[PDB]
Structures are given as structure tokens and as C-alpha cells.
Amino acid sequence: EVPLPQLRAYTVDASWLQPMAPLQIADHTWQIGTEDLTALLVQTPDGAVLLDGGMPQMASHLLDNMKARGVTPRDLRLILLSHAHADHAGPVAELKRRTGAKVAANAESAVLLARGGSDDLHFGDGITYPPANADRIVMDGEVITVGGIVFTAHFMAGHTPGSTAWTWTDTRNGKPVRIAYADSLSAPGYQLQGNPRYPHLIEDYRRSFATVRALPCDVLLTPHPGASNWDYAAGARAGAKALTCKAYADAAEQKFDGQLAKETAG
Ligand SMILES: [Zn+2]
Ligand SMILES: [Zn+2]
């Protein structure tokens, strides 16, 4: 007699769960997640913004890094997301419970967040996390202003329907730095062609490559730092090899075309 399988936890490479101290990106922007998952803290006279949180178990670590930076729980005002998968929005519910923070997201991201990533178009219930609800729904190109830092949403559907790039301008060595936090452009294990749950997947990815190519982009960051050739563990040279937005888009498109060809052959 054979039981049903046990539930399988969402396990990841150790580096994704390896805590790091805050790594400064620009004057008010810091990487505060793990070595291999981005979680960006933007500090303002008017409160802090967090872009992504990483995995569900990262909440306390994030709060510790925030504290190191002079940001108390009450100080966190806003949470923004690249996309609502467990490896990026994992600790949002907990952060909302433990801080002042409100979440802004597009409708697709909000619906996926509210189901804790369950019934994923591709993953089913394989990769889930505690559900959270959005406080504010944003539209494509909508801005959110926090202490004169303007964050702009750029939809780039594909990896998830609600995938978003967030752009803002910080400063460094006395000059403006246009930061582009571009979402994932991967399609890991996805059925790309004739997917009944996502009929226009290919078209969306193609538009998203073009969107990423054109972002205002002095510095690119990505949810998985490796995708943009960041090495958070490399200290002073963490961002030295970072791709441009143009190079990131091109690499992703070339990879996508390869995947299409292999799928046709499979
Ligand atoms: Zn994802
Ligand atoms: Zn991911």
C-alpha cells in the first residue's frame, strides 16, 4: 500500500538564504536581502520603501538590516514587488503584520499575492507562501512618490502576468543615478506555445523584452542578482560587472528564442 506523497517544501540553493549586511547601491538605496535574492531598501526623509523581500523566512533578517540602517518597523511605509512568487514576495504578509508598511501592486500581482502564489499559471501549488493583500492598485506607468523619490511602474508581463519593472532616480558621487529594478525575464519550465492558461504568453514576453531595453537605466538590478551579473558577495565590486538593461533584455530574448526552439523540438 502506497500513501499519497508528502507535501514538498519549496527548497532553494543555500546562497538564496545566506544573510548579508546592507550593501549600498546609491546614496539612499541598499541591498538588504541575501547573497542571491534582492530586497532593496530605499530610504527617504519621509519613510522607507522596500522593493521585494525574497523568501518567506527572510522577514526577521530584513527587519534586522532595516534596523542597522536606522529604519524602525514604523518607518517602513511601502512595499513594492517585482512579481508575486515565493522567492520575492515570500515575507510580505509577515512584514505587513510587523511594520507600518502598505503594499502597492498591479491587479495581476495583487490577485496572485492574495492567493499566496497558489494556482500559479505554471507552478500550480508547488511554490506558495503566506497570502497578503495589496493596499493600493497601480496602473502601467503610474508613479508613487515617497519623499521626492518618484517610483515608476513599467509592466513587463511574462514571467508572471503582473511582472513589473520599477524605476527611480537616486544619486551617487554627486550625480543622478537612474536605477532600473527590472523583473525576471525567465520562463523556467514554462509551456510557452499554446498555453491555455496564458494564450498570449509569447507576445507578452516579446513586448517585455522591448520594455526592458528602453528603461531609464544607469544601473540595472534584478530579483535574482545573477540575471544582471551582480555579485552581492563581492563587496566593493558587487555591481562592477552588471549588465545594462539593453544587454539583459537581449540575453533574455536569446534565451527565450532557444527555449521556443527546444519546446517545438520536444
Ligand atoms: Zn518568479
Ligand atoms: Zn524568482
Side-chain angles (χ1 to χ4, degrees):
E1 243 331 317
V2 180
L4 304 172
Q6 298 284 344
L7 298 168
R8 297 102 96 273
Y10 179 39
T11 61
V12 300
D13 280 0
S15 56
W16 295 25
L17 294 176
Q18 176 51 60
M20 64 179 285
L23 167 72
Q24 188 160 27
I25 309 296
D27 285 346
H28 313 279
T29 306
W30 298 72
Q31 156 59 14
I32 63 159
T34 55
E35 297 193 339
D36 258 340
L37 291 169
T38 303
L40 300 173
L41 182 78
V42 176
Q43 305 184 54
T44 275
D46 256 35
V49 177
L50 178 74
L51 303 96
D52 291 352
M55 294 280 289
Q57 61 267 237
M58 284 170 50
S60 288
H61 165 70
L62 294 170
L63 256 8
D64 286 343
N65 270 353
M66 284 170 203
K67 180 85 291 314
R69 297 265 67 248
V71 172
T72 66
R74 287 164 198 28
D75 287 335
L76 186 71
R77 274 190 67 166
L78 176 68
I79 292 168
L80 305 179
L81 298 174
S82 59
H83 66 277
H85 279 162
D87 52 328
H88 310 287
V92 165
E94 181 177 350
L95 291 171
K96 288 192 83 191
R97 288 200 305 276
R98 298 180 65 183
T99 74
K102 292 184 171 195
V103 167
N106 55 23
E108 267 298 304
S109 292
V111 165
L112 181 64
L113 183 76
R115 198 192 53 313
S118 68
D119 193 23
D120 188 81
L121 306 189
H122 307 284
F123 300 150
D125 289 342
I127 308 190
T128 66
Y129 59 91
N133 254 106
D135 296 279
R136 174 171 174 178
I137 302 288
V138 294
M139 294 287 283
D140 198 3
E142 188 165 356
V143 312
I144 301 171
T145 309
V146 184
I149 301 187
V150 184
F151 299 84
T152 303
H154 312 254
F155 295 2
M156 47 173 289
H159 182 85
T160 69
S163 281
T164 301
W166 284 103
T167 67
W168 63 103
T169 303
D170 198 347
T171 59
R172 170 135 156 208
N173 302 330
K175 280 254 103 202
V177 179
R178 297 166 296 178
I179 301 176
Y181 189 39
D183 199 16
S184 309
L185 289 166
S186 59
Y190 293 8
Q191 170 184 333
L192 309 175
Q193 302 175 87
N195 189 322
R197 293 292 271 289
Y198 198 159
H200 296 304
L201 183 154
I202 297 170
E203 281 184 356
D204 280 356
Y205 268 86
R206 291 213 183 283
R207 187 171 190 194
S208 295
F209 307 136
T211 289
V212 168
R213 178 181 313 139
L215 293 172
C217 183
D218 294 317
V219 175
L220 166 66
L221 297 145
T222 54
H224 295 276
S228 62
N229 252 265
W230 270 83
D231 178 8
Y232 290 152
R237 294 301 174 241
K241 322 179 184 175
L243 296 185
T244 64
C245 283
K246 287 173 60 177
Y248 172 50
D250 184 76
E253 180 152 44
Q254 298 296 300
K255 289 202 229 69
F256 187 89
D257 290 350
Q259 181 168 355
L260 238 25
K262 285 163 96 287
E263 176 183 291
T264 292

PDB file of all heavy atoms in Angstrom, residues 7 14 24 36 46 50 52 75 102 126 149 151 178 182 186-187 189-190 210 214 224 229-230 232 234-235 239 256:
ATOM      1  N   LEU A   7       3.777  16.571   1.285  1.00  0.00           N
ATOM      2  CA  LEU A   7       3.980  17.911   0.707  1.00  0.00           C
ATOM      3  C   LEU A   7       5.505  18.110   0.603  1.00  0.00           C
ATOM      4  O   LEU A   7       6.238  17.674   1.504  1.00  0.00           O
ATOM      5  CB  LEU A   7       3.319  18.998   1.538  1.00  0.00           C
ATOM      6  CG  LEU A   7       1.809  18.925   1.698  1.00  0.00           C
ATOM      7  CD1 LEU A   7       1.344  19.889   2.781  1.00  0.00           C
ATOM      8  CD2 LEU A   7       1.151  19.246   0.357  1.00  0.00           C
ATOM      9  N   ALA A  14      21.423  27.239  -1.158  1.00  0.00           N
ATOM     10  CA  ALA A  14      21.790  27.903   0.115  1.00  0.00           C
ATOM     11  C   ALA A  14      22.070  29.388  -0.055  1.00  0.00           C
ATOM     12  O   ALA A  14      21.719  30.196   0.851  1.00  0.00           O
ATOM     13  CB  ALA A  14      22.965  27.154   0.747  1.00  0.00           C
ATOM     14  N   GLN A  24      25.439  49.086  -0.046  1.00  0.00           N
ATOM     15  CA  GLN A  24      24.947  50.357  -0.619  1.00  0.00           C
ATOM     16  C   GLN A  24      25.007  50.312  -2.139  1.00  0.00           C
ATOM     17  O   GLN A  24      26.097  50.029  -2.682  1.00  0.00           O
ATOM     18  CB  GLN A  24      25.723  51.557  -0.073  1.00  0.00           C
ATOM     19  CG  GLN A  24      25.124  52.886  -0.496  1.00  0.00           C
ATOM     20  CD  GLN A  24      25.581  54.010   0.424  1.00  0.00           C
ATOM     21  OE1 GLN A  24      26.655  53.939   1.025  1.00  0.00           O
ATOM     22  NE2 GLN A  24      24.741  55.031   0.511  1.00  0.00           N
ATOM     23  N   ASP A  36      21.902  35.887  -2.748  1.00  0.00           N
ATOM     24  CA  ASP A  36      21.317  35.592  -4.070  1.00  0.00           C
ATOM     25  C   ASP A  36      19.852  35.998  -4.217  1.00  0.00           C
ATOM     26  O   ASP A  36      19.261  35.505  -5.194  1.00  0.00           O
ATOM     27  CB  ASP A  36      21.590  34.113  -4.423  1.00  0.00           C
ATOM     28  CG  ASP A  36      22.741  33.956  -5.410  1.00  0.00           C
ATOM     29  OD1 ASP A  36      23.112  34.901  -6.110  1.00  0.00           O
ATOM     30  OD2 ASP A  36      23.297  32.836  -5.531  1.00  0.00           O
ATOM     31  N   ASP A  46      11.021  60.940   4.368  1.00  0.00           N
ATOM     32  CA  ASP A  46       9.594  60.656   4.542  1.00  0.00           C
ATOM     33  C   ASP A  46       9.270  59.168   4.673  1.00  0.00           C
ATOM     34  O   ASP A  46       8.111  58.800   4.382  1.00  0.00           O
ATOM     35  CB  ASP A  46       8.821  61.294   3.380  1.00  0.00           C
ATOM     36  CG  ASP A  46       8.066  62.559   3.719  1.00  0.00           C
ATOM     37  OD1 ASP A  46       8.528  63.357   4.546  1.00  0.00           O
ATOM     38  OD2 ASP A  46       6.983  62.688   3.102  1.00  0.00           O
ATOM     39  N   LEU A  50      10.498  49.326   0.586  1.00  0.00           N
ATOM     40  CA  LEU A  50      11.155  48.050   0.326  1.00  0.00           C
ATOM     41  C   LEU A  50      10.637  47.513  -1.021  1.00  0.00           C
ATOM     42  O   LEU A  50       9.417  47.522  -1.236  1.00  0.00           O
ATOM     43  CB  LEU A  50      10.817  47.058   1.467  1.00  0.00           C
ATOM     44  CG  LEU A  50      11.415  45.686   1.242  1.00  0.00           C
ATOM     45  CD1 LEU A  50      12.935  45.734   1.490  1.00  0.00           C
ATOM     46  CD2 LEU A  50      10.816  44.669   2.229  1.00  0.00           C
ATOM     47  N   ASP A  52      10.689  44.194  -2.956  1.00  0.00           N
ATOM     48  CA  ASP A  52      10.851  42.761  -2.721  1.00  0.00           C
ATOM     49  C   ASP A  52      11.394  42.468  -1.316  1.00  0.00           C
ATOM     50  O   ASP A  52      12.096  43.245  -0.671  1.00  0.00           O
ATOM     51  CB  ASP A  52      11.703  42.034  -3.754  1.00  0.00           C
ATOM     52  CG  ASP A  52      11.036  41.932  -5.122  1.00  0.00           C
ATOM     53  OD1 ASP A  52       9.847  42.291  -5.221  1.00  0.00           O
ATOM     54  OD2 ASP A  52      11.767  41.500  -6.041  1.00  0.00           O
ATOM     55  N   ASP A  75       8.814  52.952  10.447  1.00  0.00           N
ATOM     56  CA  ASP A  75       9.409  53.765   9.384  1.00  0.00           C
ATOM     57  C   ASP A  75       9.161  53.176   7.979  1.00  0.00           C
ATOM     58  O   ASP A  75       9.311  53.916   6.999  1.00  0.00           O
ATOM     59  CB  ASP A  75      10.918  53.927   9.611  1.00  0.00           C
ATOM     60  CG  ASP A  75      11.304  54.860  10.750  1.00  0.00           C
ATOM     61  OD1 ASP A  75      10.527  55.752  11.110  1.00  0.00           O
ATOM     62  OD2 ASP A  75      12.428  54.655  11.276  1.00  0.00           O
ATOM     63  N   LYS A 102       2.526  49.437   3.787  1.00  0.00           N
ATOM     64  CA  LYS A 102       1.385  49.107   2.894  1.00  0.00           C
ATOM     65  C   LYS A 102       1.968  48.632   1.581  1.00  0.00           C
ATOM     66  O   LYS A 102       3.092  49.030   1.230  1.00  0.00           O
ATOM     67  CB  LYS A 102       0.446  50.300   2.727  1.00  0.00           C
ATOM     68  CG  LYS A 102      -0.229  50.547   4.096  1.00  0.00           C
ATOM     69  CD  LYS A 102      -1.260  51.672   4.020  1.00  0.00           C
ATOM     70  CE  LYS A 102      -2.031  51.702   5.342  1.00  0.00           C
ATOM     71  NZ  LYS A 102      -3.258  52.524   5.190  1.00  0.00           N
ATOM     72  N   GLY A 126       2.922  24.317  -6.327  1.00  0.00           N
ATOM     73  CA  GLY A 126       4.270  23.889  -5.982  1.00  0.00           C
ATOM     74  C   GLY A 126       5.085  24.888  -5.190  1.00  0.00           C
ATOM     75  O   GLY A 126       6.016  24.473  -4.473  1.00  0.00           O
ATOM     76  N   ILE A 149      11.217  60.880  -3.799  1.00  0.00           N
ATOM     77  CA  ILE A 149      11.720  59.815  -4.701  1.00  0.00           C
ATOM     78  C   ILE A 149      10.472  59.307  -5.437  1.00  0.00           C
ATOM     79  O   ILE A 149       9.544  58.863  -4.774  1.00  0.00           O
ATOM     80  CB  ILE A 149      12.570  58.745  -3.974  1.00  0.00           C
ATOM     81  CG1 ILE A 149      13.777  59.497  -3.324  1.00  0.00           C
ATOM     82  CG2 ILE A 149      13.029  57.607  -4.914  1.00  0.00           C
ATOM     83  CD1 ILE A 149      14.825  58.558  -2.690  1.00  0.00           C
ATOM     84  N   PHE A 151       8.819  56.697  -7.828  1.00  0.00           N
ATOM     85  CA  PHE A 151       8.930  55.327  -8.345  1.00  0.00           C
ATOM     86  C   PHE A 151       7.927  55.178  -9.499  1.00  0.00           C
ATOM     87  O   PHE A 151       6.755  55.506  -9.248  1.00  0.00           O
ATOM     88  CB  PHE A 151       8.633  54.252  -7.289  1.00  0.00           C
ATOM     89  CG  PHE A 151       9.582  54.306  -6.122  1.00  0.00           C
ATOM     90  CD1 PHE A 151       9.321  55.193  -5.074  1.00  0.00           C
ATOM     91  CD2 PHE A 151      10.729  53.505  -6.115  1.00  0.00           C
ATOM     92  CE1 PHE A 151      10.201  55.242  -3.998  1.00  0.00           C
ATOM     93  CE2 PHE A 151      11.613  53.550  -5.036  1.00  0.00           C
ATOM     94  CZ  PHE A 151      11.330  54.415  -3.973  1.00  0.00           C
ATOM     95  N   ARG A 178      19.982  56.756 -12.426  1.00  0.00           N
ATOM     96  CA  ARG A 178      18.661  56.176 -12.803  1.00  0.00           C
ATOM     97  C   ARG A 178      18.742  54.668 -12.600  1.00  0.00           C
ATOM     98  O   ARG A 178      19.334  53.945 -13.383  1.00  0.00           O
ATOM     99  CB  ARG A 178      18.300  56.592 -14.221  1.00  0.00           C
ATOM    100  CG  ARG A 178      18.142  58.114 -14.359  1.00  0.00           C
ATOM    101  CD  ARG A 178      18.121  58.532 -15.788  1.00  0.00           C
ATOM    102  NE  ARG A 178      19.409  58.235 -16.429  1.00  0.00           N
ATOM    103  CZ  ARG A 178      19.659  58.464 -17.715  1.00  0.00           C
ATOM    104  NH1 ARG A 178      18.780  58.985 -18.576  1.00  0.00           N
ATOM    105  NH2 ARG A 178      20.870  58.126 -18.181  1.00  0.00           N
ATOM    106  N   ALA A 182      14.533  45.781 -12.820  1.00  0.00           N
ATOM    107  CA  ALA A 182      13.752  45.065 -13.856  1.00  0.00           C
ATOM    108  C   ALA A 182      13.429  43.666 -13.350  1.00  0.00           C
ATOM    109  O   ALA A 182      14.312  42.968 -12.841  1.00  0.00           O
ATOM    110  CB  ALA A 182      14.506  45.004 -15.182  1.00  0.00           C
ATOM    111  N   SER A 186      12.857  35.228 -17.281  1.00  0.00           N
ATOM    112  CA  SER A 186      12.961  33.773 -17.403  1.00  0.00           C
ATOM    113  C   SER A 186      11.574  33.145 -17.591  1.00  0.00           C
ATOM    114  O   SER A 186      10.552  33.782 -17.284  1.00  0.00           O
ATOM    115  CB  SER A 186      13.613  33.207 -16.137  1.00  0.00           C
ATOM    116  OG  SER A 186      12.812  33.555 -14.996  1.00  0.00           O
ATOM    117  N   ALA A 187      11.603  31.918 -18.055  1.00  0.00           N
ATOM    118  CA  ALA A 187      10.341  31.130 -18.195  1.00  0.00           C
ATOM    119  C   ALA A 187      10.647  29.708 -17.764  1.00  0.00           C
ATOM    120  O   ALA A 187      10.596  28.787 -18.581  1.00  0.00           O
ATOM    121  CB  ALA A 187       9.885  31.245 -19.654  1.00  0.00           C
ATOM    122  N   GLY A 189      10.735  26.206 -16.962  1.00  0.00           N
ATOM    123  CA  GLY A 189       9.855  25.029 -17.116  1.00  0.00           C
ATOM    124  C   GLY A 189       8.502  25.383 -17.738  1.00  0.00           C
ATOM    125  O   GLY A 189       7.602  24.516 -17.765  1.00  0.00           O
ATOM    126  N   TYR A 190       8.341  26.612 -18.218  1.00  0.00           N
ATOM    127  CA  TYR A 190       7.048  27.045 -18.766  1.00  0.00           C
ATOM    128  C   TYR A 190       6.749  26.371 -20.111  1.00  0.00           C
ATOM    129  O   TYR A 190       7.668  26.289 -20.949  1.00  0.00           O
ATOM    130  CB  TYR A 190       6.997  28.563 -18.997  1.00  0.00           C
ATOM    131  CG  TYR A 190       7.040  29.411 -17.735  1.00  0.00           C
ATOM    132  CD1 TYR A 190       7.287  28.881 -16.464  1.00  0.00           C
ATOM    133  CD2 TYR A 190       6.838  30.786 -17.869  1.00  0.00           C
ATOM    134  CE1 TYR A 190       7.324  29.702 -15.340  1.00  0.00           C
ATOM    135  CE2 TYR A 190       6.874  31.628 -16.750  1.00  0.00           C
ATOM    136  CZ  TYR A 190       7.116  31.066 -15.497  1.00  0.00           C
ATOM    137  OH  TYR A 190       7.135  31.925 -14.430  1.00  0.00           O
ATOM    138  N   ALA A 210      11.250  44.435 -25.141  1.00  0.00           N
ATOM    139  CA  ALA A 210      11.335  45.799 -25.676  1.00  0.00           C
ATOM    140  C   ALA A 210      11.206  46.821 -24.570  1.00  0.00           C
ATOM    141  O   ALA A 210      11.894  47.873 -24.545  1.00  0.00           O
ATOM    142  CB  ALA A 210      10.323  45.995 -26.811  1.00  0.00           C
ATOM    143  N   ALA A 214      14.283  49.593 -23.202  1.00  0.00           N
ATOM    144  CA  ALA A 214      14.092  51.043 -23.232  1.00  0.00           C
ATOM    145  C   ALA A 214      14.020  51.708 -21.870  1.00  0.00           C
ATOM    146  O   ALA A 214      13.858  52.939 -21.856  1.00  0.00           O
ATOM    147  CB  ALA A 214      12.849  51.375 -24.067  1.00  0.00           C
ATOM    148  N   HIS A 224      16.763  38.158  -9.088  1.00  0.00           N
ATOM    149  CA  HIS A 224      17.908  37.205  -8.948  1.00  0.00           C
ATOM    150  C   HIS A 224      19.141  37.940  -9.470  1.00  0.00           C
ATOM    151  O   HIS A 224      19.158  38.265 -10.667  1.00  0.00           O
ATOM    152  CB  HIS A 224      17.682  35.947  -9.819  1.00  0.00           C
ATOM    153  CG  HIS A 224      16.485  35.161  -9.307  1.00  0.00           C
ATOM    154  ND1 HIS A 224      16.561  34.247  -8.283  1.00  0.00           N
ATOM    155  CD2 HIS A 224      15.190  35.211  -9.732  1.00  0.00           C
ATOM    156  CE1 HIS A 224      15.333  33.744  -8.075  1.00  0.00           C
ATOM    157  NE2 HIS A 224      14.547  34.311  -8.930  1.00  0.00           N
ATOM    158  N   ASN A 229      24.078  40.068 -13.649  1.00  0.00           N
ATOM    159  CA  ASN A 229      25.507  39.894 -13.348  1.00  0.00           C
ATOM    160  C   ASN A 229      26.018  40.683 -12.163  1.00  0.00           C
ATOM    161  O   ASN A 229      27.206  41.047 -12.125  1.00  0.00           O
ATOM    162  CB  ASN A 229      26.358  40.144 -14.618  1.00  0.00           C
ATOM    163  CG  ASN A 229      26.808  38.719 -14.957  1.00  0.00           C
ATOM    164  OD1 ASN A 229      27.902  38.332 -14.547  1.00  0.00           O
ATOM    165  ND2 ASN A 229      25.889  38.036 -15.635  1.00  0.00           N
ATOM    166  N   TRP A 230      25.164  40.806 -11.164  1.00  0.00           N
ATOM    167  CA  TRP A 230      25.564  41.376  -9.862  1.00  0.00           C
ATOM    168  C   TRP A 230      26.129  40.212  -9.045  1.00  0.00           C
ATOM    169  O   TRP A 230      25.732  39.055  -9.223  1.00  0.00           O
ATOM    170  CB  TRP A 230      24.363  42.013  -9.175  1.00  0.00           C
ATOM    171  CG  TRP A 230      24.134  43.447  -9.485  1.00  0.00           C
ATOM    172  CD1 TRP A 230      23.489  43.991 -10.576  1.00  0.00           C
ATOM    173  CD2 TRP A 230      24.562  44.565  -8.682  1.00  0.00           C
ATOM    174  NE1 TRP A 230      23.487  45.345 -10.472  1.00  0.00           N
ATOM    175  CE2 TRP A 230      24.144  45.731  -9.333  1.00  0.00           C
ATOM    176  CE3 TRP A 230      25.253  44.659  -7.472  1.00  0.00           C
ATOM    177  CZ2 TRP A 230      24.385  47.001  -8.824  1.00  0.00           C
ATOM    178  CZ3 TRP A 230      25.492  45.921  -6.959  1.00  0.00           C
ATOM    179  CH2 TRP A 230      25.066  47.075  -7.622  1.00  0.00           C
ATOM    180  N   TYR A 232      26.442  40.055  -5.129  1.00  0.00           N
ATOM    181  CA  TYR A 232      26.312  40.785  -3.856  1.00  0.00           C
ATOM    182  C   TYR A 232      27.417  40.486  -2.843  1.00  0.00           C
ATOM    183  O   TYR A 232      27.680  41.336  -1.964  1.00  0.00           O
ATOM    184  CB  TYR A 232      24.912  40.549  -3.271  1.00  0.00           C
ATOM    185  CG  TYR A 232      23.791  41.218  -4.045  1.00  0.00           C
ATOM    186  CD1 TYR A 232      22.525  40.600  -3.988  1.00  0.00           C
ATOM    187  CD2 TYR A 232      23.917  42.383  -4.807  1.00  0.00           C
ATOM    188  CE1 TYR A 232      21.428  41.144  -4.664  1.00  0.00           C
ATOM    189  CE2 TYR A 232      22.836  42.920  -5.495  1.00  0.00           C
ATOM    190  CZ  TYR A 232      21.590  42.302  -5.410  1.00  0.00           C
ATOM    191  OH  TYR A 232      20.534  42.861  -6.086  1.00  0.00           O
ATOM    192  N   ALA A 234      30.515  40.342  -3.534  1.00  0.00           N
ATOM    193  CA  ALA A 234      31.831  40.867  -3.981  1.00  0.00           C
ATOM    194  C   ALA A 234      32.169  42.255  -3.471  1.00  0.00           C
ATOM    195  O   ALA A 234      33.084  42.905  -4.024  1.00  0.00           O
ATOM    196  CB  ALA A 234      31.917  40.761  -5.497  1.00  0.00           C
ATOM    197  N   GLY A 235      31.476  42.687  -2.437  1.00  0.00           N
ATOM    198  CA  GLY A 235      31.724  43.949  -1.746  1.00  0.00           C
ATOM    199  C   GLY A 235      31.815  45.131  -2.705  1.00  0.00           C
ATOM    200  O   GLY A 235      30.813  45.455  -3.357  1.00  0.00           O
ATOM    201  N   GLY A 239      28.731  45.417  -8.063  1.00  0.00           N
ATOM    202  CA  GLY A 239      27.989  45.801  -9.277  1.00  0.00           C
ATOM    203  C   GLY A 239      28.877  46.016 -10.487  1.00  0.00           C
ATOM    204  O   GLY A 239      28.402  46.492 -11.532  1.00  0.00           O
ATOM    205  N   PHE A 256      15.135  32.953 -24.535  1.00  0.00           N
ATOM    206  CA  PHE A 256      13.705  32.690 -24.814  1.00  0.00           C
ATOM    207  C   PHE A 256      13.556  32.037 -26.199  1.00  0.00           C
ATOM    208  O   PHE A 256      12.845  31.021 -26.336  1.00  0.00           O
ATOM    209  CB  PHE A 256      12.903  33.977 -24.668  1.00  0.00           C
ATOM    210  CG  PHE A 256      11.414  33.779 -24.775  1.00  0.00           C
ATOM    211  CD1 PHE A 256      10.727  33.495 -23.584  1.00  0.00           C
ATOM    212  CD2 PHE A 256      10.728  33.920 -25.969  1.00  0.00           C
ATOM    213  CE1 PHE A 256       9.352  33.308 -23.589  1.00  0.00           C
ATOM    214  CE2 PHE A 256       9.334  33.723 -25.987  1.00  0.00           C
ATOM    215  CZ  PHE A 256       8.653  33.426 -24.791  1.00  0.00           C
TER     216      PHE A 256
END
